[PDB]
Design a protein around this ligand. Structure first.
Ligand code: HEM
Ligand code: HEM
Ligand SMILES: Cc1cc(N)nc(COc2cccc(OCC3CCNCC3)c2)c1
Ligand SMILES: Cc1cc(N)nc(COc2cccc(OCC3CCNCC3)c2)c1
Ligand SMILES: C[C@H](O)[C@H](O)[C@H]1CNc2nc(N)[nH]c(=O)c2N1
Ligand SMILES: C[C@H](O)[C@H](O)[C@H]1CNc2nc(N)[nH]c(=O)c2N1
Ligand SMILES: [Zn+2]
Lengths: 418, 420
């Protein structure tokens, strides 16, 4: 019932009471742990699944109850009157609207409960842009551009989420088909390999399939593909002036820059579903700033990504004959030193994995005292390099699902009717 | 029910039907995941929890069932008579003895089932030494020495395990107090600094208290502390000629040797409990060979261990002033390069993390093919550096508990009833 977590490097023990509020399910049972499945059913929301009048009210009450608790006015007339108001409106309309205040609290808290996110110490500083009055793709494009500009802030990045109208009958969905607002194109060849980013090959083709003339570079910023109100989606190019990029160079190896690598500054996840008080915001792109490893370990070095390790090791003149020389490892460290140094040099916000994990531990400790715990997913929180020399490695974490939340949702192209 | 696991680097999908044979429990529920908890309730065995006839026979039946399928004799006359024999023996004596074959099979399986072990490709080559005739500590010391010598094999290491008598009434336990058979002393100093291995401080105090005269150096092999038949434990120095050690140097850095580091060649875990057919074998040391990171990342570089990163980064004159310089990540790699280099030079078996994880992926796929699954703990299988440039990071894994199995048990010094 009450539950301990131990840091094995510091012997600190924290008691968890927050988990007993867990409203959603994990994927696990007494018989099988699923802690390392990317996408259990539970973590996804399929669009067929429209909320019914009966399921919606419980969800609303629970949400409004925590809302009114947070502003220390639990069980007050304003609490009670709101609960009735929303009640009535469900009874009549079969949905309800959130007050701005609730929208903002809802968004901040979905981030707060993102148990896979290492960056949550920052959860309370989110800028929320209410785009609920949007009606078209053009509108969405305008909203996104404003989001991007505000977030980038000349390199001094600021967290933001833009919130498009909530799902209704699931026929009128707003969606951003892009998985991130800013990503590079991926192209195959007759040759057979890949040019640019292999992660985006399909999506890159879906855009070309829609009229995108592609400049066919290794770093073509993909067009936004936007869908308002269940309509066919539309292509739009983000003004390059709004897309901050960093050329990647090494603080010690001047040959580094000769590979002509760069990366974009703004990580802005776009494909997720934001759920507040049973309401579904299926388009809610959000952004903050990069932990260095997301670019350097994963984006460059994952086999099925830019896979530059082989290339970097060669220029480093390391013994690539045998795994046991740790050449892959050696190179991985330099590549990451480079990314951090470039961003830092161009005064664009970035955090190293040592620092982020330190902050997250402070954050857990804060959440244990003030809230009674902090849901956390060790498989995702531990960074993908130097795992055990970061303090999160030695930290037991409890993972459970609280609401409001971000959830995954199927790729729109498998679901949309034309 | 069928269950699917995806590998996100290769899109290989596998199907687990084996989880359906899973008896024990995880710690998780529909509403919590305890997958990152180190010692959950269910992964441990308190010695006060000694089994009744009541619960024993199903566990015995289950196990003998598994045993006779593996040798293709399910429902054999030999199978039924063994069932009735064991049954008669349980009602009569309240326990029962494993045949040699069953001990051998049980032990391989515990290993095969060890979901936190990346070494498992090797599970079928385990030398099992049956020490079920041992009645004393001195008997224990003698057995362990033969294990160490045989497993060491002049640097060409061989998996082995030594199995001492099972629990009876939980008052007569055999136990190896050591957590590993070979380990370096740790000494807290009055100024608060530690000399030798910080992991081992407590155990070192117990030893010193039990009579050990401590050389008090940075790398002193601790004596064995051994309990037989529930008796107070006794002390023994492994003969040094039996302890293979490898001085640590770096292929390119000549100053590295001057850090004065060395490590022992044989990883040999001695504190776990072996559960076979409901039977409990509370001293059962087993040994293998090292994955480099186990010394190079954890043993030297954990803040809570020899913590040599500072000194190695110093000597590389790295920019240690900001973390964002990755001086820790850089020092970590060099140290690990050094560890693999020293072991290979001296022809002491060792495996690097890339090579071990690749093997484990092949093992795992084969285990799905022919066994119907492979229980795996991702949190433990992924290496402690360079996670995502090894293929296990991208591998979805089902974790669940099968018997036979290796369990944790509480530290003997916490539970033992002193004879004085
Ligand atoms: C401010 C800097 C931030 C940093 C450094 C950061 C860091 C991370 C990292 C490393 C991950 C792991 C995912 C991966 O490897 O691709 C992650 C996941 C995530 N973060 Fe953040 N984060 C930040 C801000 C945000 C913001 C603003 C939100 C939303 C408001 C957010 C919500 C999430 C969610 C939902 C996930 C995981 C989705 C899932 O699988 O369930 N984070 N974060
Ligand atoms: C062949 C050489 C072997 C290698 C390279 C190897 C590798 C490993 C590693 C790296 C771990 C994780 C431990 C840690 O990081 O602290 C581990 C766990 C384990 N291995 Fe091995 N292993 C080997 C042989 C064996 C043998 C012979 C056995 C028993 C017969 C065994 C049983 C285990 C068990 C039971 C655990 C996990 C303990 C737990 O439940 O928490 N392994 N192995
Ligand atoms: C706002 C934000 C900031 C940041 N630094 N990093 C992120 C990335 O976090 C997410 C959040 C949700 C999904 C996701 O993508 C999953 C893919 C799967 C393969 N590896 C990582 C990317 C990544 C977001
Ligand atoms: C036979 C063998 C070979 C090998 N290479 N590595 C191992 C390591 O296996 C274990 C098996 C059980 C416990 C354990 O360590 C547990 C604690 C927790 C943190 N690490 C060290 C002590 C390590 C065994
Ligand atoms: C199979 C495994 O669950 C998958 O590769 C996960 C593991 N941990 C991760 N952790 C982070 N931060 N990001 C990821 O994409 C993944 N991938
Ligand atoms: C809290 C966490 O479970 C703990 O630090 C675990 C994580 N993964 C590990 N993995 C291995 N191989 N060895 C370990 O000791 C640990 N420690
Ligand atoms: Zn779990």
């Amino acid at each position: 019932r009450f539950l301990k977590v131990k840091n094995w490097e510091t012997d600190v023990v924290l008691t968890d009471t927050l988990h007993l509020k867990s409203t959603l399910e994990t994927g696990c049972t007494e018989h099988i742990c699923m802690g390392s499945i990317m996408l259990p059913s539970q973590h996804t929301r399929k669009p067929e699944d429209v909320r019914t009048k009966d399921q919606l009210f419980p969800l609303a009450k629970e949400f409004l109850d925590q809302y009114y608790s947070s502003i220390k006015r639990f069980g007050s007339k304003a609490h009670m009157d709101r609960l009735e108001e929303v009640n009535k409106e469900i009874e009549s309309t079969s949905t309800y609207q959130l007050k701005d205040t609730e929208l903002i609290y809802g968004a901040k808290h979905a981030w707060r409960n993102a148990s896979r996110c290492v960056g949550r110490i920052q959860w309370s500083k989110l800028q929320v842009f209410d785009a609920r009055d949007c009606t078209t793709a053009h509108g969405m494009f305008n909203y996104i551009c404003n989001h991007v500009k505000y977030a980038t802030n000349k390199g001094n990045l600021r967290s933001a989420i833009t919130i498009f109208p909530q799902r209704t009958d699931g026929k009128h969905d707003f969606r951003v088909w892009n998985s991130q607002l800013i990503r590079y194109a991926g192209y195959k060849q007759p040759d057979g390999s890949t040019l640019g980013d292999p992660a985006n090959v399909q999506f890159t083709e879906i855009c070309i399939q829609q009229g995108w003339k592609a400049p066919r570079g290794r770093f073509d910023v993909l067009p936004l593909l936007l869908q308002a109100n269940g309509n066919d989606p539309e292509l739009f190019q983000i003004p390059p002036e709004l897309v901050l990029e960093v050329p990647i160079r090494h603080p010690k190896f001047d040959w580094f820059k000769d590979l002509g690598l760069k990366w974009y500054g703004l990580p802005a996840v776009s494909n997720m579903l934001l759920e507040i008080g049973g309401l579904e915001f299926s388009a809610c792109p959000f952004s903050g700033w990069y932990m260095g490893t997301e670019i350097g370990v994963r984006d460059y070095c994952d086999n099925s990504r830019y896979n530059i390790l082989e290339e970097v090791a060669k220029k480093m003149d390391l013994d690539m004959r045998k795994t046991s020389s740790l050449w892959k490892d050696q190179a991985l460290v330099e590549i990451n030193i480079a990314v951090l140094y470039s961003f830092q040099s161009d005064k664009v916000t970035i955090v190293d994995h040592h620092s982020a994990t330190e902050s997250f531990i402070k954050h857990m400790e804060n959440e244990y005292r003030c809230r009674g715990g902090c849901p956390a997913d060790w498989v995702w929180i531990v960074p993908p390099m130097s795992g055990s020399i970061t303090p999160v490695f030695h930290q037991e974490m409890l993972n459970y699902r609280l609401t409001p939340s971000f959830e995954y949702q199927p790729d729109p192209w498998n679901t949309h009717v034309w």
